[PDB]
Design goal:
The structure is cut from a larger assembly and holds chains A, B, C and D. Helix content of chain A is about 40%, strand content about 20%. Chain A has 4 helices and 3 strands. Chain B has 2 domains: about 1-115, no CATH class; about 115-175, Helix non-globular (Single alpha-helices involved in coiled-coils or other helix-helix interfaces), CATH 6.10.250. Chain B has helices at about 55-70, 95, 115-135, 150-155, 160-185, 210-215, 230-240, and strands spanning about 10-15, 25-35, 45-50, 75-80, 110-115. Chain C is α+β, with helices and mostly antiparallel strands. Chain C has 5 domains: about 1-15 and about 190-200 and about 240-395, Poly(a)-polymerase, middle domain, CATH 1.10.1410; about 15-190 and about 225-240, no CATH class; about 400-505 and about 550-575, Alpha-Beta Plaits (2-Layer Sandwich); about 575-945, no CATH class; about 945-1075, Alpha-Beta Plaits. In chain C, helix 16 packs across helix 18 and helix 24 crosses helix 25. Chain D has no helix or strand. Chain D is elongated and about 25 Å long. The termini of chain D are far apart. Classes of the chains: A alpha+beta, B alpha+beta, C alpha+beta, D little secondary structure. The interface between B and C is large, with 63 and 72 residues. Bound molecules: adenosine-5'-triphosphate and magnesium ion. Adenosine-5'-triphosphate binds near residues 89, 102, 103, 278 and 358 of chain C. Chain B: Belongs to the RRP7 family. Chain B: It comes from Saccharomyces cerevisiae (strain ATCC 204508 / S288c) (Baker's yeast). Chain B: It is found in: Nucleus, Nucleolus. Chain B: This is Ribosomal RNA-processing protein 7. Chain B: One of its GO terms (molecular function) is rRNA binding.
Chain lengths: ~110, ~240, ~1100, ~15
């Protein structure tokens, strides 16, 4: 991310048959899979780099990244059940309490007597 | 004050300025010449230079009206073309980005008249007005500097009418869809030249104009160094 | 590395002393030695006889306090021929040219027979030395008159390295032997013979003044005085062995000077203790070892760069004060001992002399920090750091060098108060010879203990301390001193810690059944201010609590209380300069505004929370296209708005925060630009409709945007949150970016430069705007003082009528430079410190030939790599090739987000760009000539307004200060939103439109923020104009003039200025009042 | 007051 948060994202997609499709199966050729895999990898990299970790999570909740993948790969091959399967956090930067407090939105004590 | 006409042919038209408390007989001077142009929309016009701030047609209707009354001439200004005080309309971004919905100096404007009789009537009046500064400067007319358009311009932080806005978006979208639809049919309608040459159009092409622009925007590897008898001899010559 | 080496050579040759003056001084002091041989001997004398001997003479003996009294002066005095020798840098031929001048250290060894084995006790040796110097000065004076040289020499006593115990004679020349042009002064150092006193008795732990406490300072003076030639011989060997000794020596000398480091004493209060000698000795020590395993750290084959780097690295990484010290043998490999003496120690077992006694703990820590910082600069490969390391003086201004400065006026200052003087006592006199030394430590310990973690480094400077006095006097006489104390007043200089500078409570030792020693000192130190308190986590700790204020930091209150309690109840501590800067920041009209600190961003967060509520509503509504993301891009989302957000303060210009709304990618977007924009509005209509129906508490209205030229169909939806905040929504579409590029391509060759500018403004608002706010917000958390300084900087610009032309982002990019690139200084830790550093940068910025390129990253990735760095440099050179004079573009600000460098700094007229630099230069010059004070700060923030051709006075019908959220007030939005305009300032729109009409003839400027810079009521604003040179004079009449002109001849016209005021006035209507032309 | 005569040739640099 732009916050120097190193993370690994896993996407999963499936092929679907068209509305008028008569063939039992909807397999895609290996060229299509590589073409789709290239498009997905580009989108995932683009979204993460142009975003903070907080902004990245804000994208995961509405699942906007999945819909973006669907439109991009729509011309390659129809797809279904597109999801960001998993997100791993590999490395973290130096901890910054100031940034953490802002994400959560100091206190005088009480005299003991 | 004795100056009436500029030697290049621009007639001076002195105007009296308003009185404001901040400013306790200062004048504004306009320069005018007849415009000759074969173009119909630029025919029957008067070239003007050094316009006052925010000079619309309603301003010209007032001034020409005053001249008509003073010199009992009949003149009617049709419209005021090419009035770009702030240069907002110098370029038409709609025309550059596409042809659908748009088939298309500074501190100056062209004053159109209804007919040839009105323009020459105004000019004989205008020459007479220019003489006045030399003789009786008091009777010079006064520019109002306030009109209904001026108040609207002054009120910058005014919310737009949603009802007006909704209608404008509707008509424009309705018109655009008609034009977009017509263009797509035209390209994908089996265009055949007079000499039986069928144009090539790809699927998803929407405008013939785009086809023209894509056109404007847009052996060595198969050769063998050692295949013919002359070639290997050449290699032999260089080898030794 | 080759570039660095060639730069090193250029520096050495530039500062190399001219050899002619060496002959001149050598021609003199060689003759001076003959004079010293002429001086006769003297007999044994007691204090009574020498006092009578000197009673009538002009000369006076410079006896060191305590002066010898008849009872304890039983020992006798005598003079004999010394062993004259030359020492110092000049002996090593390592000197350089100094415009202020250098000094030649001549040593006169007193003969050994003048001393007894126990003469290092009770100042016995020092008093013998003093009369020896006085007798020499007496005879030197008469002989100087004899040879007719008195006409152009001035003789005065002085203290060696500001050491009160070692007076010396300083020979200086005024305007054949006249060496005035040489810029040299001969110093006569009266040292002792080597090993007269058993060095073991003179160790730092031992004592030599009977009263037992140790006397490290007294022991060093006598011992160092007896070891002078020996260290010359040691450095002489090292000079022969390594060929690069002298080159490294000058580099350290140049490095030390720029940081304000000298060999003078620091216990008095000045920053010093480390000079060319100490730097040379440390390097010599490292050439013979230095590692913990006694392995060589420096090799004799190293070059000048490598020798300097090793010494800098050794200082940076090894601790010599608290945990560890280094021992070497001058006459044996140097070894780093892990044990520490709690004071800087570079021990010399051969001579039993600690070379770093003159260095204080406080000064040493600052040395280590400076050494550490340059090591980082020295390893940097992307940027050249030669100029920062060697060619930048950071000691010119204390305020730029130190975050906060407090001057303490001690009481009764022709001697300090009896109670204050009584604290000195006799024990501390043995430990600390002078009260100035004693007072310096006293201020240091209490201030260090009181502030604790709130500060990083502390310096106690005795302002107005003199070190040279006439021959007729025995000690230095200060005007306030009356020969009692040698200083005017003391100044406490601090390097605050932004993370913990503003903590409300000072934590202390935890509670225990039996009160620990740490608990005792805490309660005793703080007295009534101390308390035992309990917190949410359940801990019981001794802590004292303070009160935050928006005018001054907590540190001002702590130092005042601590110093008064322990130093003197009558002390007066004052730092008004910081108070003025804090007050110049607008005070928000929120609850407890005055008690809020300047580092508190609660107001910004509240605006964010109201946004997050609206963020949820928009997403959940159903639209034809799903909402991809909502990105806030307003100023308040990166903590840069001049005046903090205030609910319902809609007169503020920055009330409506821009928000970029982006939908999912679709292929149904219109392909024509106006159709695309009208399609965008249609989506905003639906958002307003569903928002109005489902959430009626929100209010909304539509406004037009004309920022992007020629795109007149942009419509933005303004949402008025119930919390009292306004948000402006604009739709971003992927097709929009490529449509502009199409316009550029289809535009005619002459029009293409105009269209690319339109694209430049689009990318500045929609594409580049998102990136700017993201990075600046994240970075600002690490730089706590970035938000206040940029706000105050934008306040400084507005008063001088520059924000109208300087876009918001450009100001932030200039204001962040001292933080991301603090070299050679530190990161700002004060509002006063940060603002002045921005002004210092603009003053010395040669934007015609130097670009500004920034690494918007947190303190030590996104660091600019060498490839990216060179690429941006190439962009600058290409641009300057077409624009050498800088007319079209002036400021080149580039970074990762903006590699082009022209994104945020285009369109600024050259008159404005020079004005920004011209004001910055005058601000710095004003600070040099007159120090920072209340009057100067007011001059900084007052506009001249006399340079402009004509000046216009405006007044709004109603004051806007209250509706702008500024506390010297609306609590709901108007029922009819048309009433909003009634409480707005249009003069910003006034100048913008007039500039377009009079772009070719006039340049009009105005104050953007009328609430802040419009007087008490915030209703007065000013338009100031400038007439370009061409149209000021008459011009021949042509169609293309594009100027409002009046005829004079048939083909001559002149600027019809009188008409221009009418158009300005007619535009203003009631607002305009008065004109000055 | 903080006054500097306007420079239009960039001579201040
Ligand atoms: N900290 C010290 N410890 C021991 N001896 C010292 C110390 N500082 C100076 N001396 C002695 O004093 C002599 C002169 O000191 P001084 O600081 O004037 O030398 P320098 O480096 O040549 O000076 P400058 O920077 O003025 O050219 C040194 O040669 C050394 O004999
Ligand atoms: Mg010296």
């Amino acid at each position: 991310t732009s916050d120097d948060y190193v993370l690994r994202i896993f996407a999963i997609a499936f092929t679907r048959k068209q509305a008028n499709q008569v063939k039992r199966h909807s397999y895609a050729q290996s060229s299509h899979i590589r073409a789709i895999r290239k498009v997905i990898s580009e989108i995932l990299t683009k979204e993460v780099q142009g975003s903070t970790l907080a902004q990245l999570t804000s994208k995961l909740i509405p699942e906007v990244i999945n819909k973006e993948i669907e439109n991009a790969t729509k011309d390659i091959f129809p797809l279904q059940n597109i999801h960001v399967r998993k997100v791993k956090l590999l490395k973290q930067p130096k901890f910054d309490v100031g940034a953490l407090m802002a994400l959560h939105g100091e206190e005088k004590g009480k005299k003991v007597t | 004050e004795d100056i009436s006409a500029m030697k290049n042919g621009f007639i001076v038209v002195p105007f009296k300025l308003p009185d404001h408390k901040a400013l306790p007989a200062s004048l504004h001077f306009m320069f005018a010449k007849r415009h000759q142009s074969s173009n119909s929309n630029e025919s029957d016009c008067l070239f003007l230079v050094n316009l006052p701030l925010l000079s619309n047609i309603e301003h010209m209707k007032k001034f020409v009206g005053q001249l008509c009354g003073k010199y009992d001439t009949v003149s009617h200004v049709e419209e005021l073309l090419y009035n770009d005080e702030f240069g907002l309309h110098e370029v038409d971004l709609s025309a550059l980005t596409s042809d659908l919905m748009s088939s298309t100096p500074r501190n100056t404007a062209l004053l159109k008249f209804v007919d040839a009789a009105s323009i020459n009537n105004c000019w004989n009046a205008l020459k007479k007005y220019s003489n006045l500064h030399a003789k009786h400067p008091n009777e010079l007319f006064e520019w109002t500097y306030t009109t209904p358009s001026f108040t609207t311009f002054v009120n910058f932080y005014k919310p737009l009418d949603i009802d007006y806005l909704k209608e404008d978006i509707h008509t424009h979208m309705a018109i655009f869809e008609q034009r977009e639809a017509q263009a797509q049919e035209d390209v994908q309608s089996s265009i055949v030249d007079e000499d039986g040459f069928t144009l090539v159009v790809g699927k998803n092409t929407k405008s013939l104009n785009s086809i023209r622009k894509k056109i404007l925007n847009k052996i060595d590897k198969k050769a063998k160094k050692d295949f013919y008898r002359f070639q290997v001899r050449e290699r032999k010559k260089q080898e030794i | 590395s080759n570039i660095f080496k060639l730069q090193i050579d250029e520096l050495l040759e530039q500062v190399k002393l001219k050899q002619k003056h060496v002959l001149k001084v050598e021609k003199f002091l060689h003759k001076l030695y003959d004079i010293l041989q002429e001086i006769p001997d003297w007999e044994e004398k007691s204090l009574a006889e020498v006092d009578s001997f000197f009673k009538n003479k002009i000369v006076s003996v410079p006896f060191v306090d305590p002066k010898p009294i008849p009872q304890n002066t039983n020992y006798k005095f005598n003079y004999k021929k010394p062993d004259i020798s030359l020492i110092g840098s000049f002996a090593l031929k390592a000197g350089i040219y100094q415009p202020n001048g250098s000094s030649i250290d001549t040593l006169l060894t007193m003969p050994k027979e003048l001393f007894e084995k126990k003469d290092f006790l009770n100042f016995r040796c020092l008093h013998k030395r003093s009369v020896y110097l006085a007798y020499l000065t007496h005879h030197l004076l008469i002989l100087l008159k004899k040879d007719k040289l008195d006409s152009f020499l001035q003789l005065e006593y002085s203290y060696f390295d500001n050491d009160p115990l070692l007076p010396i004679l300083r020979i200086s020349c005024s305007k054949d032997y006249n060496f005035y042009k040489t810029r040299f002064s001969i110093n006569l150092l009266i040292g002792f013979p080597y090993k007269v006193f058993e060095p073991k008795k003179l160790l730092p732990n031992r004592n030599c003044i009977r009263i037992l406490p140790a006397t490290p300072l007294y022991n060093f003076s006598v011992l160092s005085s007896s070891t002078h030639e020996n260290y010359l011989k040691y450095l002489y060997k090292t000079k022969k062995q390594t060929e690069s000794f002298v080159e490294a020596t000058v580099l350290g000398r140049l490095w030390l000077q720029q940081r304000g480091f000298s060999s003078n004493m620091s216990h008095s209060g000045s920053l010093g203790g480390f000079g060319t000698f100490e730097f040379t000795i440390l390097m010599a020590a490292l050439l013979n070892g230095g590692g913990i395993n006694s392995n060589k750290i420096l090799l004799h084959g190293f070059s000048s760069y490598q020798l300097f780097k090793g010494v800098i690295k050794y200082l940076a990484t090894m601790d010599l004060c608290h945990d560890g010290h280094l021992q070497f043998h001058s006459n044996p490999a140097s070894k780093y001992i892990d044990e520490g003496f709690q004071t800087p120690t570079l021990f010399d077992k051969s001579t039993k002399v600690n070379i770093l006694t003159k260095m204080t703990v406080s000064s040493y820590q600052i040395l280590k920090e400076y050494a550490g910082e340059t090591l980082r600069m020295l390893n940097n490969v992307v940027q050249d750091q030669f100029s920062n390391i060697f060619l930048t003086n950071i000691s010119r201004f204390d305020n730029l060098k130190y975050d906060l400065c407090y001057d303490v006026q001690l009481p009764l200052g022709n001697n300090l108060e009896t109670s204050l003087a009584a604290t000195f006592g006799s024990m501390e006199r043995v430990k600390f010879i002078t009260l100035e030394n004693f007072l310096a430590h006293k201020i240091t310990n209490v201030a260090r203990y009181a502030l604790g973690d709130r500060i990083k480094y502390i310096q106690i400077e005795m302002v107005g301390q003199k070190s040279d006095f006439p021959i007729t006097k025995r000690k230095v006489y200060s005007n306030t001193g009356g020969n009692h104390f040698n200083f005017d007043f003391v100044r406490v200089k601090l390097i605050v810690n932004p993370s913990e500078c503003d903590k409300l409570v000072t934590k202390g030792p935890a509670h225990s059944e039996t009160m620990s020693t740490e608990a005792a000192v805490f309660k005793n130190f703080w007295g009534i201010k101390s308390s035992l308190r309990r917190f949410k986590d359940g801990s019981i700790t001794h802590c004292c609590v303070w009160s935050t204020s928006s005018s001054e930091p907590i540190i001002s209150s702590i130092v005042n209380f601590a110093l008064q309690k322990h130093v003197s109840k009558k002390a007066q501590i004052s730092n008004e300069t910081i108070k003025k800067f804090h007050n110049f920041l607008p005070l928000p009209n929120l609850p407890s505004s005055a008690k809020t600190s300047v580092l508190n961003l609660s107001s910004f967060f509240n605006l964010k929370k109201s946004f997050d509520d609206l963020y949820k509503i928009i997403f959940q509504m159903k639209l034809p296209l799903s909402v991809k993301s909502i990105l806030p891009v307003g100023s308040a989302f990166r903590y840069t708005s001049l005046c903090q957000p205030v609910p319902f303060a809609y007169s503020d210009p920055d009330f409506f925060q821009d928000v970029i709304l982006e939908f999912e990618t679709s292929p149904k977007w219109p392909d024509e630009i106006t159709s695309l924009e009208k399609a965008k509005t249609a989506f905003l209509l639906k958002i307003q409709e569903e928002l109005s129906a489902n959430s009626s508490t929100y209010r909304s209205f539509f406004s037009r945007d004309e920022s992007i030229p020629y795109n007149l169909e942009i419509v933005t939806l303004n949402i008025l949150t119930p919390e009292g905040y306004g948000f402006k929504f604009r739709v971003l579409t992927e097709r929009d970016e490529i449509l502009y590029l199409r316009a550029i391509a289809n535009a005619r060759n002459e029009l293409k430069p105009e269209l690319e500018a339109t694209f430049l403004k689009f990318t500045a608002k929609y594409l580049a705007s998102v990136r700017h706010t993201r990075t600046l917000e994240n970075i600002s958390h690490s730089y706590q003082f970035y938000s206040p300084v940029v706000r105050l900087f934008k306040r400084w610009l507005d008063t001088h009528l520059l924000l109208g032309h300087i876009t918001d982002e450009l100001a932030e990019l200039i204001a962040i430079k001292p933080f991301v690139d603090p070299a050679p200084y530190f990161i700002p830790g004060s509002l006063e410190n940060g603002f002045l550093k921005v002004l210092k940068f603009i003053s010395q910025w040669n934007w015609k030939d130097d670009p500004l390129i920034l690494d918007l990253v947190k303190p030590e990735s996104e660091r600019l790599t060498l490839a990216q760095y060179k690429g941006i440099q190439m962009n600058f050179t290409n641009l300057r090739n077409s624009d050498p004079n800088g007319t079209h573009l002036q400021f080149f600000v580039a970074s990762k987000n903006d590699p082009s460098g022209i994104l945020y700094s285009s369109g600024i007229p050259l008159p404005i760009a020079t004005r920004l630099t011209a004001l910055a230069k005058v601000a710095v010059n004003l600070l040099q000539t007159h120090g920072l004070n209340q009057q100067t700060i007011n001059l900084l923030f007052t506009p001249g307004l006399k340079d402009y051709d004509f000046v216009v006075d405006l007044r709004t019908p109603i004051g806007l200060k209250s509706s702008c959220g500024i506390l010297s007030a609306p609590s709901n939005f108007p029922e009819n939103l048309n009433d909003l305009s009634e409480k707005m300032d249009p003069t910003y729109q006034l100048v913008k439109y007039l500039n377009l009409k009079y772009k070719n003839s006039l340049i009009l400027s105005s104050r953007k923020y009328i609430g802040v810079n419009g007087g008490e009521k915030g209703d007065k604003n000013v338009i100031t104009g400038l007439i370009k040179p061409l149209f000021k004079g008459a011009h021949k009449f042509r169609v293309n003039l594009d100027c409002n002109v009046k005829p004079v001849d048939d083909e001559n016209v002149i600027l019809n200025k009188e008409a221009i005021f009418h158009e300005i006035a007619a535009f203003g209507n009631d607002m305009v009042i008065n004109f000055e032309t | 007051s903080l006054s500097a005569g306007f420079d239009w040739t960039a001579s201040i640099l």
